[PDB]
């Protein structure tokens, strides 16, 4: 009935006047005077070759060495940066793969795509192949991200504007995360494993709560859609690329929008989102085959990554924070430096 | 200067490159379909004669298919339809015994509208398949060819009714130099479908070929 | 010896040159551009791409020896250089030569096997293979196309080194053989080619699209260019055949025009090497026009 | 129908009653961390190439 309509419009008006209340000074000023990054110049230092088609996801191993990447040929190819060695190809079930993870113990990795199958494989075994372990089930629609929280937990978000949090020893879904109204297409994990926050598709972002319970902040601005989230090293903050070719800065604390990465030149949407070790430069990777470096406390520019021939969809950063690598639709993976 | 346990790991590197090499080149030689429609317009009796994606292989002349009918996704199409860039061509199933109930033929035109001017579909073929033949004789002999499509000029017989039908599909076609529909009039039981396909696909890749020579 | 009787009477000499300037820019510029694209410029990278690129390599080889040409023109003929560099401008000049057209055939055969057969395995073949039938191919030509370097081509008649590998002779040796195959046989396999591939597109109402047109003019005009290069010089060829037949080794008067002619039509093999550029790289919809 | 208005309605009081610091502290906060770890992270202070791994 409208009693709840106009009770929900109060409490709104409530909210965005607390937001408001709270807000006096912007970043720009406190940080109008800190000196410029300078320009940053990366030269690419090992190309990875070996995939024949599009390449939809990648992940760092916690060793800042190995890293997984998923194609759409059906094959997941496990690397060794170093000397560019390839140490295991799985042939997947199912080619329409869009996204990977790797386990921070280094036994496991998983994917998922079109299938709405969450598949996790077991590298560490006593007949020298890569076998799978489980399939997990549930989900009513695609998956767009999977990220690992133990050996025994993992996190998916699927295209049913639903997230869960799984239990890979049984196979069943602990707690379902709901409140959403878009597909949810990226996630990001708080460096404590705590908290993780969702980009969906209704043009907005909320924070759960693993241990239990669900959102608590509902973060909005976007005009369009989130295709990309990543926390900050600190935790208290997160970064969002949409397809309103804006990149924006969110903080916890007080709860409201920082700032915005925005230019003139730039129309097309937002891939990636990554942040560096200390925390200043936030990489993103666009569709119009480029890589810019912002330097994130002053909004500015501070140098580009070019040399891909294709669209970038997927990019990371080691957890050292001595490499960036970019994967593309040209089938060719390429660690800066 | 590599070590003893280097070379080794260099040679099964090359081996992995080796195997990755052949499943390319044998996957390399597939026809890969994509089927599309408006749901319960005949897509049942078309996989017939030939949770997510249902994939379905079949095999004619020495060539292997490969048709993908993503049926169930109900999320937006817009987040997953550049995963089908690289198809061969598109099979449409539109039923012509729709037109006098609801409006669906709307919503085909619609949908039909939708999937051919995509951006990323600006030089793949279409295949259209017009079904429910049969039932269509009584439908049209007995309601007229005006309650879905007003401002008709024409009879009330086959003759007519299977053309303006066709006519408007193809003509909402716009970028008419780089693509090309291929129409059909199937029916509960022809046999003869197969050949159609493998026709417009020998067609798709001939011109194929013909740009990949630079010739186009 | 004394088999053969040879002639220069200033009148080629008179000819020639400009022709032979007039070719060799056209053909630097459109090679060097050709192999600049190919090179660096060019992303994707096929197997009837490195066909074509092995073409533009033995065009580019022949442009480049085009200079010395005027030479055994210019002052007349002299060739004030000595032994080795006679027999390394005939021996490129004939393995350019070679080369060129039988590529020219590969390209038809490639192109005959996509539209006539377009689910034959052959369409699609590595890189890598493409590079060792184009290093085999390369290695045949070389072949053929050494006996030149063993014997002396350095005939002098007094105060002029007539650089000559083309004689009055009669012996129907290698050099004769290879000039008359090298135009039979890739004439008939390209006939055979192009009539193939018209006809079945012809047939198959693939004609109602715009580009196929142009790219049955293109196919035509590929058998018209080598038609009207290499035929007049074979032609001559035989005719000094039946000439040589008929008559003996003396009476060099019914031998003696047939010099000039023989060489003015030779002209046209390389006027076939700009010519090339154009009509296989540029006239393309691949790149932008 | 009333249900979900009602879910909705109480996820907004919760959302309603969470505690919110000024936007300077949390900007100080912030410089605070990317100055003082400014010297670990090799990708805006570039390290000699003879600890790079990856030279090449
Ligand atoms: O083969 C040639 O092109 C040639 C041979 C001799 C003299 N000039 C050209």
């Given at each position: 009935?409208?009693?709840?309509?106009?009770?929900?419009?109060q409490?709104?008006?409530?909210?965005?006047?607390?937001?408001?209340?709270?807000?006096?000074?912007?970043?720009?000023?406190?940080?109008?005077?800190?000196?410029?990054?300078?320009?940053?110049?990366?030269?690419?230092?090992?190309?990875?070759?070996?995939?024949?088609?599009?390449?939809?996801?990648?992940?760092?191993?916690?060793?800042?060495?190995?890293?997984?990447?998923?194609?759409?040929?059906?094959?997941?190819?496990?690397?060794?940066?170093?000397?560019?060695?390839?140490?295991?190809?799985?042939?997947?079930?199912?080619?329409?793969?869009?996204?990977?993870?790797?386990?921070?113990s280094?036994?496991?990795?998983?994917?998922?795509?079109?299938?709405?199958?969450?598949?996790?494989?077991?590298?560490?075994?006593?007949?020298?192949?890569?076998?799978?372990?489980?399939?997990?089930?549930?989900?009513?629609?695609?998956?767009?991200?999977?990220?690992?929280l133990?050996?025994?937990?993992?996190?998916?978000?699927?295209?049913?504007?639903?997230?869960?949090?799984?239990?890979?020893?049984?196979?069943?879904?602990?707690?379902?995360?709901?409140?959403?109204?878009?597909?949810?297409?990226?996630?990001?994990?708080?460096?404590?494993?705590?908290?993780f926050?969702?980009?969906?598709?209704?043009?907005?972002?909320k924070?759960?709560?693993?241990?239990?319970?669900?959102?608590?902040?509902?973060?909005?601005?976007?005009?369009?859609?989130?295709?990309?989230?990543?926390?900050?090293?600190?935790?208290?903050?997160?970064?969002?690329?949409?397809?309103?070719?804006?990149?924006?800065?969110?903080?916890?604390?007080?709860?409201?929008?920082?700032?915005?990465?925005?230019?003139?030149?730039?129309?097309?949407?937002?891939?990636?989102?990554?942040?560096?070790?200390?925390?200043?430069?936030?990489?993103?990777?666009?569709?119009?085959?480029?890589?810019?470096?912002?330097?994130?406390?002053?909004?500015?520019?501070?140098?580009?990554?070019?040399?891909?021939?294709?669209?970038?969809?997927?990019?990371?950063?080691?957890?050292?924070?001595?490499?960036?690598?970019?994967?593309?639709?040209?089938?060719?993976?390429?660690?800066?430096? | 200067?590599?070590?003893?346990?280097?070379?080794?790991?260099?040679?099964?590197?090359?081996?992995?490159?080796?195997?990755?090499?052949?499943?390319?080149?044998?996957?390399?030689?597939?026809?890969?379909?994509?089927?599309?429609?408006?749901?319960?317009?005949?897509?049942?009796?078309?996989?017939?004669?030939?949770?997510?994606?249902?994939?379905?292989?079949?095999?004619?002349?020495?060539?292997?298919?490969?048709?993908?009918?993503?049926?169930?996704?109900?999320?937006?199409?817009?987040?997953?339809?550049?995963?089908?860039?690289?198809?061969?061509?598109?099979?449409?199933?539109?039923?012509?015994?729709?037109?006098?109930?609801?409006?669906?033929?709307?919503?085909?035109?619609?949908?039909?509208?939708?999937?051919?001017?995509?951006?990323?579909?600006?030089?793949?073929?279409?295949?259209?398949?017009?079904?429910?033949?049969?039932?269509?004789?009584?439908?049209?002999?007995?309601?007229?060819?005006?309650?879905?499509?007003?401002?008709?000029?024409?009879?009330?017989?086959?003759?007519?009714?299977?053309?303006?039908?066709?006519?408007?599909?193809?003509?909402?076609?716009?970028?008419?130099?780089?693509?090309?529909?291929?129409?059909?009039?199937?029916?509960?039981?022809?046999?003869?479908?197969?050949?159609?396909?493998?026709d417009?696909?020998?067609?798709?890749?001939?011109?194929?070929?013909?740009?990949?020579?630079?010739?186009? | 010896?004394?088999?053969?009787?040879?002639?220069?009477?200033?009148?080629?000499?008179?000819?020639?040159?400009?022709?032979?300037?007039?070719?060799?820019?056209?053909?630097?510029?459109?090679?060097?551009?050709?192999?600049?694209?190919?090179?660096?410029?060019?992303?994707?990278?096929?197997?009837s791409?490195?066909?074509?690129?092995?073409?533009?390599?033995?065009?580019?080889?022949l442009?480049?020896?085009?200079?010395?040409?005027?030479?055994?023109?210019?002052?007349?003929?002299?060739?004030?250089?000595?032994?080795?560099?006679?027999?390394?401008?005939?021996?490129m000049?004939?393995?350019?030569?070679?080369?060129?057209?039988?590529?020219?055939?590969v390209?038809?055969?490639?192109?005959?096997?996509?539209?006539?057969?377009?689910?034959?395995?052959?369409?699609?073949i590595?890189?890598?293979?493409?590079?060792?039938?184009?290093?085999?191919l390369?290695?045949?030509?070389?072949?053929?196309?050494?006996?030149?370097?063993?014997?002396?081509?350095?005939?002098?008649?007094?105060?002029?080194?007539?650089?000559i590998?083309?004689?009055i002779?009669?012996?129907?040796?290698?050099?004769?053989?290879?000039?008359?195959?090298?135009?039979?046989?890739?004439?008939?396999?390209?006939?055979?080619?192009?009539?193939?591939?018209?006809?079945?597109?012809?047939?198959?109402?693939?004609?109602?699209?715009?580009?196929?047109?142009?790219?049955?003019?293109?196919?035509?005009?590929?058998?018209?260019?080598?038609?009207?290069?290499?035929?007049?010089?074979?032609?001559?060829?035989?005719?000094?055949?039946?000439?040589?037949?008929?008559?003996?080794?003396?009476?060099?008067?019914?031998?003696?025009?047939?010099?000039?002619?023989?060489?003015?039509?030779?002209?046209?093999?390389?006027?076939?090497?700009?010519?090339?550029?154009?009509?296989?790289?540029?006239?393309?919809?691949?790149?932008?026009? | 129908?009333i249900?979900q208005?009602?879910?909705?309605?109480?996820?907004?009081?919760?959302?309603?009653?969470?505690?919110?610091?000024?936007?300077?502290?949390?900007?100080?906060?912030?410089?605070?961390?990317?100055?003082?770890?400014?010297?670990?992270?090799?990708?805006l202070?570039?390290?000699?190439?003879?600890?790079?791994?990856?030279?090449e």
């Open positions: 009935l409208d009693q709840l309509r106009q009770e929900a419009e409490l709104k008006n409530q909210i965005r006047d607390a937001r408001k209340a709270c807000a006096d000074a912007t970043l720009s000023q406190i940080t109008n005077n800190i000196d410029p990054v300078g320009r940053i110049q990366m030269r690419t230092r090992r190309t990875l070759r070996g995939h024949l088609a599009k390449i939809y996801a990648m992940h760092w191993g916690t060793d800042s060495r190995l890293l997984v990447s998923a194609s759409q040929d059906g094959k997941l190819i496990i690397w060794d940066s170093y000397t560019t060695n390839k140490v295991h190809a799985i042939p997947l079930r199912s080619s329409w793969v869009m996204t990977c993870a790797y386990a921070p280094g036994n496991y990795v998983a994917c998922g795509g079109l299938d709405n199958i969450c598949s996790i494989y077991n590298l560490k075994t006593r007949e020298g192949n890569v076998r799978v372990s489980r399939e997990l089930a549930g989900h009513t629609g695609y998956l767009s991200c999977c990220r690992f133990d050996d025994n937990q993992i996190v998916t978000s699927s295209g049913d504007t639903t997230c869960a949090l799984w239990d890979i020893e049984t196979g069943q879904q602990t707690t379902t995360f709901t409140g959403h109204t878009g597909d949810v297409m990226s996630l990001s994990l708080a460096p404590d494993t705590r908290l926050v969702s980009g969906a598709c209704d043009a907005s972002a924070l759960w709560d693993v241990r239990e319970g669900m959102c608590r902040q509902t973060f909005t601005g976007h005009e369009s859609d989130i295709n990309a989230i990543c926390f900050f090293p600190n935790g208290n903050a997160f970064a969002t690329g949409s397809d309103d070719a804006t990149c924006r800065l969110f903080d916890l604390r007080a709860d409201q929008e920082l700032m915005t990465y925005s230019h003139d030149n730039i129309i097309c949407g937002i891939t990636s989102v990554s942040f560096s070790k200390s925390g200043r430069l936030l990489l993103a990777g666009y569709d119009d085959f480029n890589c810019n470096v912002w330097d994130a406390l002053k909004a500015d520019r501070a140098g580009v990554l070019a040399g891909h021939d294709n669209r970038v969809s997927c990019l990371g950063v080691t957890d050292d924070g001595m490499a960036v690598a970019t994967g593309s639709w040209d089938s060719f993976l390429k660690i800066w430096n | 200067t590599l070590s003893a346990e280097d070379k080794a790991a260099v040679e099964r590197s090359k081996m992995i490159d080796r195997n990755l090499r052949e499943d390319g080149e044998k996957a390399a030689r597939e026809v890969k379909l994509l089927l599309l429609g408006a749901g319960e317009s005949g897509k049942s009796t078309i996989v017939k004669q030939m949770t997510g994606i249902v994939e379905t292989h079949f095999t004619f002349k020495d060539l292997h298919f490969k048709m993908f009918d993503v049926g169930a996704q109900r999320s937006e199409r817009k987040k997953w339809i550049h995963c089908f860039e690289g198809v061969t061509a598109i099979i449409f199933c539109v039923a012509l015994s729709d037109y006098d109930l609801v409006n669906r033929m709307h919503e085909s035109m619609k949908l039909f509208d939708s999937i051919c001017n995509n951006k990323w579909f600006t030089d793949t073929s279409i295949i259209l398949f017009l079904n429910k033949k049969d039932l269509f004789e009584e439908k049209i002999k007995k309601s007229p060819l005006t309650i879905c499509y007003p401002e008709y000029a024409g009879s009330n017989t086959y003759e007519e009714a299977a053309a303006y039908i066709q006519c408007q599909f193809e003509d909402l076609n716009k970028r008419k130099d780089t693509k090309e529909i291929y129409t059909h009039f199937t029916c509960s039981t022809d046999t003869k479908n197969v050949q159609f396909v493998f417009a696909v020998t067609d798709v890749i001939i011109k194929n070929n013909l740009k990949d020579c630079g010739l186009f | 010896k004394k088999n053969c009787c040879v002639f220069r009477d200033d009148f080629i000499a008179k000819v020639l040159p400009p022709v032979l300037g007039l070719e060799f820019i056209f053909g630097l510029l459109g090679n060097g551009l050709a192999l600049w694209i190919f090179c660096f410029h060019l992303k994707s990278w096929k197997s791409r490195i066909f074509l690129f092995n073409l533009a390599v033995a065009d580019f080889l442009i480049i020896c085009l200079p010395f040409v005027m030479d055994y023109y210019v002052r007349r003929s002299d060739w004030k250089f000595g032994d080795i560099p006679c027999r390394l401008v005939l021996f000049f004939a393995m350019n030569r070679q080369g060129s057209i039988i590529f020219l055939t390209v038809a055969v490639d192109r005959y096997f996509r539209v006539v057969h377009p689910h034959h395995a052959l369409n699609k590595s890189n890598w293979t493409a590079a060792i039938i184009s290093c085999l390369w290695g045949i030509t070389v072949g053929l196309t050494v006996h030149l370097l063993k014997k002396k081509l350095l005939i002098q008649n007094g105060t002029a080194n007539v650089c590998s083309f004689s002779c009669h012996t129907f040796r290698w050099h004769e053989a290879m000039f008359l195959l090298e135009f039979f046989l890739p004439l008939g396999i390209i006939l055979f080619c192009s009539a193939r591939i018209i006809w079945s597109l012809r047939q198959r109402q693939m004609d109602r699209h715009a580009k196929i047109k142009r790219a049955i003019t293109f196919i035509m005009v590929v058998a018209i260019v080598f038609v009207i290069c290499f035929l007049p010089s074979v032609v001559v060829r035989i005719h000094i055949f039946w000439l040589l037949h008929t008559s003996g080794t003396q009476n060099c008067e019914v031998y003696r025009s047939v010099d000039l002619a023989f060489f003015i039509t030779l002209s046209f093999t390389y006027m076939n090497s700009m010519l090339d550029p154009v009509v296989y790289y540029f006239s393309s919809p691949s790149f932008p026009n | 129908s249900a208005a009602r879910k909705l309605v109480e996820q907004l009081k919760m959302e309603a009653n969470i505690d919110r610091i000024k936007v300077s502290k949390a900007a100080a906060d912030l410089m605070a961390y990317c100055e003082a770890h400014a010297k670990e992270d090799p990708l202070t570039p390290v000699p190439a003879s600890e790079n791994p990856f030279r």
